[PDB]
Structure formats: C-alpha cells, structure tokens
Amino acid sequence: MEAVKTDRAPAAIGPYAQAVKAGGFVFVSGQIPLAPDGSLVEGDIRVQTERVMENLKAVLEAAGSGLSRVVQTTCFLADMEDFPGFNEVYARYFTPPYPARATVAVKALPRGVRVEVACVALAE
Amino acid sequence: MEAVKTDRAPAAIGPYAQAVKAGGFVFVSGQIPLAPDGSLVEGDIRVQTERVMENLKAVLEAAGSGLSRVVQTTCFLADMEDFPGFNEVYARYFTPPYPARATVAVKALPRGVRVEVACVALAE
Amino acid sequence: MEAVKTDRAPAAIGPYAQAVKAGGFVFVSGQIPLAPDGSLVEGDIRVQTERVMENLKAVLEAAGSGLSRVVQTTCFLADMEDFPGFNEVYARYFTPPYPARATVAVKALPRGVRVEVACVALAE
C-alpha cells in the first residue's frame, strides 16, 4: 500500500495516514473541520462541513484522484438536526453522479466537532 | 464511475446514489425502512429490518449483483435492544458464507428509523 | 467469496463471518475485547485494545494477509477520554505506512466494552 501525504490537509499525527492507495482505490481517513494549519474550525454545520469537504478534496487530489472519483462516503454527525445543513454543503462538492453514502449521528466525534467524513474513491 | 438507479427501492432522500459500481464492487448506500414509494415503514425492529433487507436486495439486483455477492455490511441501529430481532431477519436474507460485518448502536439515524444498513458486494 | 474462520480469534456468534476474502481484499468484521475462547477482557483501554488488535491480527493472518496489509480501519470508542490510550496501543500494531482511519465515540458498546474495530486489508 502507498500512503498519501499533503500539507493541504491536517497533518497525520499518529498511527494513520491521510489516505492510502491500494487495490485501485483510495481510502481516505475520516476528515474533521481542522484547517491545514491545525486550527479547529468551529461554528455551525455549514462552516464545519465546508472545511471537511476541503480536506477531503485536498487529500483526494494528492492521491491523484478527486471528488468526482469518490464512490462511497461514510458520514458521522453529532446532531441529527445538522443533517439539512450538512447535505447542503455536501452537495456543493459532490455532484451527480453522487457517491454511495451512509450517514448516522453519534455521541461524539474527535475534538468535539459536528461532523466527520471518510471516503473511498477510485485511484488514477 | 457507474451509478445504479431503480424504482424497486426507495429513491435517494439526499445527495447520494442508491449504489455505485466501481472497481469490481458495488457500493450500496445505507438503506433505511422506506418502501419503494418513499413511505416510511414503522414498527418493531423485525418489521423495519425486513424493509431494509428488501431494499438492499432490490438495489443489488439492479446493479447486476445479489445478496449472495455481498462481502461486507455496515449496520447501524438506534437501540442496542433491537440487536436480536435485527439479527433474526438479517439471517433470512444473508446465508453462509455470510458477509463480514460491523453492527453498532448509535444515537440517531435518518428519518429517525431503527436501522440503517449499507454494504459492499462483488459486481459479479 | 471465501469466508475466513479461525479459532485464534473469538468465534463469530451470529450471521456473519470473522472475515471475507474477495476482490483482492479482506473484509474483517468488528472485533471487541474477547479472547479466543470467548472470555471477556476488561480493564483499561490499553488492555482491552490489545485484545482487539490481537483479534484483528489473528483473523487477518488466517485470511493469508496481515496487519501491514491493512488499508482502512473503522474504530468505535465508548469514552472519548480513552482515545489517547487506544491510539497508543493501536500504534504498537502498525508501522508506516499506516491505515486510513475513521474514529467515533458512541454511548455504549456490547457488554460494556471500551472499544471495537473493523477493517479492510489487501489480500496480498
């Protein structure tokens, strides 16, 4: 497997890679609303989701892929009431044909953020 | 990629495709207890899981795949107490060799349903 | 698809296989702090995580793969305060390049365990 590393997304501090290229796919770690400089982006679901989308885009690009190549996303929210806003921003980055998706609300996410999104995309 | 669309399963209730075929796999979105016409299927876990299973089956068939080709499922339930009933119905649709699986109880699911099941299957 | 079955990891109790080999990948079911004979390992996050890691390792090896072939992990914790410890033990089982990862916190896990981890790896 090949690890993907880019400064355009929050650095991977720990036992994980921003993304891994393997078997024709790109497995992207769950992105949170953290700026590449390590600053946490707070605010409503729309502002936080925008940062998550930018991180995903940045990692996918560094992997030689892109948003249009994403085939599956796994989305976690901390509040069911944030679904509408999340979907609106999500739709600003992902356009038809859309990826397959699974979304759920959980107790908490890394650093207390409102949203975390991981994905799988086609390589190349 | 290659999008999968069928009227035999509920239409997507967000910016996502029912399933996506890519790299030899079929990535199926998290299915919830909605009837093909989009109406909610209320009831206990056995009733709602049956609806989810039929939706999975329909999407998989439309993708040229099937339940026996599923290699991994990601199952989310809103109530840990629903695990027994979920497993019973699940066992009516998936038979050995069973898919690899992750079953976790979470805070909330789309439309406030009891269960959401996404999966990955072999395209052939 | 080929179901993986080994006695070196907690036996699958329910409608699922410990892992499935398909499409060049190995899909591993969620593992919790259970010993091979079925005994529950309690204690702090470090001790419980070790058992989970050993379970993943055993299943992966039984599948003809290994920890170094893991490309993606999905981790669930019952207490976000346990993340530091979970991350440290997790790091003991992986070496660069590390897998892509998604981590979330849930209210509670089966049998009150502190952690659960599922993953996907290359079949070598």
Side-chain angles (χ1 to χ4, degrees):
Chain A
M1 53 175 265
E2 179 181 57
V4 176
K5 183 184 178 183
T6 177
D7 300 304
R8 302 197 61 180
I13 303 177
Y16 75 93
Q18 296 169 312
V20 172
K21 297 182 64 176
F25 294 100
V26 179
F27 297 85
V28 184
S29 291
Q31 302 304 127
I32 52 169
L34 253 177
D37 56 38
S39 300
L40 193 66
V41 170
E42 312 185 67
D44 62 43
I45 183 63
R46 292 186 171 68
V47 181
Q48 299 198 199
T49 299
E50 187 178 307
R51 185 61 256 173
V52 170
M53 292 294 114
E54 288 294 332
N55 287 341
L56 287 171
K57 182 178 176 183
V59 179
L60 289 167
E61 288 174 350
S65 189
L67 293 171
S68 66
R69 305 286 287 180
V70 175
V71 301
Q72 182 205 65
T73 61
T74 302
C75 313
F76 302 93
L77 297 177
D79 193 328
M80 64 173 274
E81 294 305 294
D82 280 340
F83 278 64
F86 169 72
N87 283 325
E88 172 180 342
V89 181
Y90 186 94
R92 295 179 189 169
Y93 291 78
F94 289 108
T95 58
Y98 295 123
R101 187 179 77 171
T103 302
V104 303
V106 295
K107 185 186 67 180
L109 296 168
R111 307 189 59 167
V113 303
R114 288 175 181 287
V115 52
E116 181 184 338
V117 178
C119 75
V120 173
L122 284 167
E124 310 159 63
Chain B
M1 59 194 76
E2 194 184 317
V4 179
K5 188 180 178 184
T6 177
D7 57 6
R8 292 185 54 177
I13 61 174
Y16 62 77
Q18 297 173 308
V20 175
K21 292 194 293 178
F25 291 105
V26 177
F27 296 88
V28 182
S29 287
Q31 299 305 124
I32 53 170
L34 292 181
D37 68 4
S39 66
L40 195 288
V41 174
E42 270 286 57
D44 60 32
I45 185 65
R46 291 181 169 74
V47 176
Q48 301 192 196
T49 298
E50 171 174 301
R51 181 67 263 169
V52 170
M53 291 296 112
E54 293 294 341
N55 291 346
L56 286 167
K57 185 176 180 177
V59 174
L60 287 164
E61 299 175 309
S65 189
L67 295 166
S68 70
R69 308 306 299 175
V70 176
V71 300
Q72 180 208 59
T73 60
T74 298
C75 312
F76 294 110
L77 287 72
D79 190 351
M80 174 68 90
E81 297 296 69
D82 282 345
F83 276 42
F86 169 74
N87 281 142
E88 183 186 328
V89 180
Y90 186 97
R92 299 171 187 170
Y93 294 76
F94 290 112
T95 164
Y98 292 120
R101 191 182 71 170
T103 304
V104 183
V106 299
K107 182 163 63 174
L109 298 170
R111 300 295 293 286
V113 304
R114 291 178 179 283
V115 51
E116 184 184 335
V117 177
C119 76
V120 172
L122 285 165
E124 295 81 42
Chain C
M1 56 186 272
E2 182 175 301
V4 181
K5 186 178 180 184
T6 180
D7 45 45
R8 290 184 57 65
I13 302 177
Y16 65 88
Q18 294 169 313
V20 171
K21 300 177 65 176
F25 291 94
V26 178
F27 299 87
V28 182
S29 298
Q31 305 297 137
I32 54 172
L34 286 178
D37 61 35
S39 299
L40 186 62
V41 173
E42 301 174 0
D44 64 36
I45 183 62
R46 291 182 170 62
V47 179
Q48 301 198 200
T49 298
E50 181 184 60
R51 186 61 255 171
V52 169
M53 294 297 94
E54 288 298 321
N55 286 342
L56 292 173
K57 179 182 178 182
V59 175
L60 284 166
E61 289 183 352
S65 183
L67 293 175
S68 64
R69 302 258 64 186
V70 174
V71 300
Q72 182 206 66
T73 62
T74 302
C75 316
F76 305 87
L77 297 174
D79 192 329
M80 187 137 86
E81 296 188 308
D82 282 336
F83 183 69
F86 161 80
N87 194 53
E88 200 187 325
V89 178
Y90 181 98
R92 300 176 183 177
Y93 287 75
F94 296 108
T95 179
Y98 300 94
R101 181 173 70 175
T103 301
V104 304
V106 291
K107 286 190 176 183
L109 286 167
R111 314 183 65 171
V113 298
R114 293 173 178 289
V115 55
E116 180 177 336
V117 179
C119 74
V120 175
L122 284 166
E124 303 210 63

